[PDB]
Amino acid sequence: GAMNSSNYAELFNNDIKLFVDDTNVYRVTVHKTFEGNVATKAINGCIFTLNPKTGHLFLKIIHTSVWAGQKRLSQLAKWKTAEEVSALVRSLPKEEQPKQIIVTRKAMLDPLEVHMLDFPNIAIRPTELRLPFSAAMSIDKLSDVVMKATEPQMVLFNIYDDWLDRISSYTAFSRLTLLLRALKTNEESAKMILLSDPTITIKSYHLWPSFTDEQWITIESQMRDLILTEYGRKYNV
Amino acid sequence: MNTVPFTSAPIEVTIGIDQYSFNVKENQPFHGIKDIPIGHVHVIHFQHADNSSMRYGYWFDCRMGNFYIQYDPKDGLYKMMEERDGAKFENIVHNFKERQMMVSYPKIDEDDTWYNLTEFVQMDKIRKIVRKDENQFSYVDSSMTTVQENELSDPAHSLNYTVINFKSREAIRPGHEMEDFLDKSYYLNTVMLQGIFKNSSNYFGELQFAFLNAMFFGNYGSSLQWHAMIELICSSATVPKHMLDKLDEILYYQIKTLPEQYSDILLNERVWNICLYSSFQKNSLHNTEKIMENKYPELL
Ligand SMILES: N[C@H](CC(=O)O)Cc1ccccc1F
Numbered sequence: 001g002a003m004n005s006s007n008y009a010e011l012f013n014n015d016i017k018l019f020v021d022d023t024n025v026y027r028v029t030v031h032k033t034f035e036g037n038v039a040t041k042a043i044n045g046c047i048f049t050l051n052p053k054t055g056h057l058f059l060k061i062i063h064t065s066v067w068a069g070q071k072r073l074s075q076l077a078k079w080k081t082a083e084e085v086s087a088l089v090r091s092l093p094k095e096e097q098p099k100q101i102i103v104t105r106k107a108m109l110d111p112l113e114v115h116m117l118d119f120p121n122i123a124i125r126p127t128e129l130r131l132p133f134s135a136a137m138s139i140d141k142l143s144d145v146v147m148k149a150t151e152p153q154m155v156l157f158n159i160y161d162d163w164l165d166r167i168s169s170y171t172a173f174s175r176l177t178l179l180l181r182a183l184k185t186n187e188e189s190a191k192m193i194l195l196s197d198p199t200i201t202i203k204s205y206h207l208w209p210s211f212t213d214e215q216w217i218t219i220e221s222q223m224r225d226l227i228l229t230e231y232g233r234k235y236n237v
Numbered sequence: 238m239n240t241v242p243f244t245s246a247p248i249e250v251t252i253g254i255d256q257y258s259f260n261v262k263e264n265q266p267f268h269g270i271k272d273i274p275i276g277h278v279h280v281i282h283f284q285h286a287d288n289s290s291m292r293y294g295y296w297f298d299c300r301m302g303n304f305y306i307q308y309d310p311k312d313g314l315y316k317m318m319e320e321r322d323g324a325k326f327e328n329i330v331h332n333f334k335e336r337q338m339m340v341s342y343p344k345i346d347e348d349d350t351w352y353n354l355t356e357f358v359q360m361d362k363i364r365k366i367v368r369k370d371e372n373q374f375s376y377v378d379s380s381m382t383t384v385q386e387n388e389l390s391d392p393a394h395s396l397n398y399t400v401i402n403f404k405s406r407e408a409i410r411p412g413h414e415m416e417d418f419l420d421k422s423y424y425l426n427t428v429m430l431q432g433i434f435k436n437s438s439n440y441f442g443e444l445q446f447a448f449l450n451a452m453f454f455g456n457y458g459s460s461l462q463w464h465a466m467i468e469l470i471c472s473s474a475t476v477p478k479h480m481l482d483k484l485d486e487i488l489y490y491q492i493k494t495l496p497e498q499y500s501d502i503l504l505n506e507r508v509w510n511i512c513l514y515s516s517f518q519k520n521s522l523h524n525t526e527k528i529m530e531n532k533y534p535e536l537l
């Protein structure tokens with residue numbers, strides 16, 4: 001059924017699973033028209049499909065041309081997401097196909113179930129976790145490849161860099177969710193924390209800086225403080 | 238006008254005949270029901286006074302044979318039987334009629350209720366949903382499950398309604414996932430009407446039969462089936478105009494007939510609110526929407 005804090009270690013067992021977040025698929029800027037009405041302009045988006053055990057992120061870039069001439073785009077976007085996840089699953093060798101797909105928003109359940117009828121053994125599940133995957137577009141290299149795309153495109157990224165050489169996937173997922181929650185709550189500050197020190201760089205083949213174990217503990221502490229700080233600023237505590 | 242005679246009434250029982258019902262006391266001199274209108278299916282149903290558990294009954298059509306009810310004390314129920322000997326059956330009915338031991342089917346002349354509930358219901362189609370080929374009549378009770386219910390357990394005692402499932406490969410064309418899920422017209426018109434039912438009359442017949450089993454037996458799987466067949470129509474953007482008009486009439490008489498005190502269990506709030514207020518056909522069921530709003534405004 002639904003995924004929550006009781007069955008949290010299930011994410012890191014040896015059953016292949018993917019998270020699917022559709023929150024950045026249909027993206028718009030709202031603006032005024034010459035006549036003083038309001039209109040939207042779509043910008044490029046992405047599906048965020050992540051294996052939490054391996055860090056594998058299949059980032060399907062959604063080019064604005066897919067919306068051309070279509071109506072009810074917020075509804076279409078869920079079905080386009082489902083279509084692309086289904087296409088990705090079918091593209092994978094059988095032994096790499098997921099056993100479970102967890103959607104971060106319950107409105108994805110029916111579209112994905114319908115697109116996956118051919119895969120009755122793949123469980124489609126919601127989650128009671130509030131996962132900060134919407135903040136994926138705050139990762140500079142992911143935002144860059146989405147915005148530069150001139151056509152539909154699937155970009156492959158390990159969202160854990162090389163962390164799994166030193167930490168478990170539970171710890172790597174916890175680090176990722178803390179970083180993304182911080183970027184979601186105060187992007188400017190979080191980025192400042194991540195790059196304040198110019199001697200720690202991001203390798204060309206990575207997303208995040210090359211922190212040592214000790215430095216990661218410092219960074220993680222600073223991100224918690226940021227989240228707590230914003231929580232206070234928000235609620236006046 | 239035909240007759241369903243009884244050998245006797247050894248146990249106290251409420252007897253239903255179509256939408257009518259009456260009480261028979263233990264060992265009361267009751268020999269059956271006369272003046273049954275020819276031309277329609279009928280249902281004679283039973284609820285024992287000492288065990289309201291298990292409503293049960295028999296669908297039959299007097300044009301297909303001479304039927305009667307005898308209590309079986311071993312199996313503990315009123316059973317419908319066929320008498321092959323025409324001569325003897327007519328003489329026994331004649332004697333029951335001379336001794337005035339029968340209740341008269343109490344049809345008001347103005348009253349088209351039963352016709353309107355059974356307009357498309359045929360015995361031949363009943364006998365394919367209820368499989369017991371050695372009999373010309375069909376037994377149904379409160380507890381019988383449907384073929385779909387069993388897939389989600391005795392197959393011989395099942396209600397073989399047409400399986401409707403909106404998230405099934407049958408309902409959804411590869412490559413038209415969103416289209417076919419949000420607009421069920423393909424599933425209604427090509428798969429069900431053209432493919433399985435052949436015409437809307439057979440579809441409405443199953444719909445009406447499902448409602449009647451839900452109402453008269455409290456049969457839960459029948460209620461599920463009735464609501465599924467309504468929803469499939471209401472959720473199709475493309476439905477023949479004559480079907481929508483006929484559906485409105487069918488549902489009107491079903492809602493009109495439903496016992497007020499059984500509305501809570503026989504009517505699915507989600508389906509009805511969706512069908513009347515959100516679906517493609519939300520504005521096509523004028524009569525049904527008006528009786529629902531005046532009779533069950535709570536449900537909505
Ligand atoms: N070595 C692969 C990275 C690559 O070659 O692009 C591992 C990988 C596979 C699939 C999705 C993301 C991902 F990082």
Ligand SMILES: N[C@H](CC(=O)O)Cc1ccccc1F
Nearest residue numbers: 242243244305320325326329
């Ligand atoms: N019980 C009669 C013969 C039998 O017992 O098998 C059949 C019958 C009962 C009552 C009314 C008409 C009729 F033909």
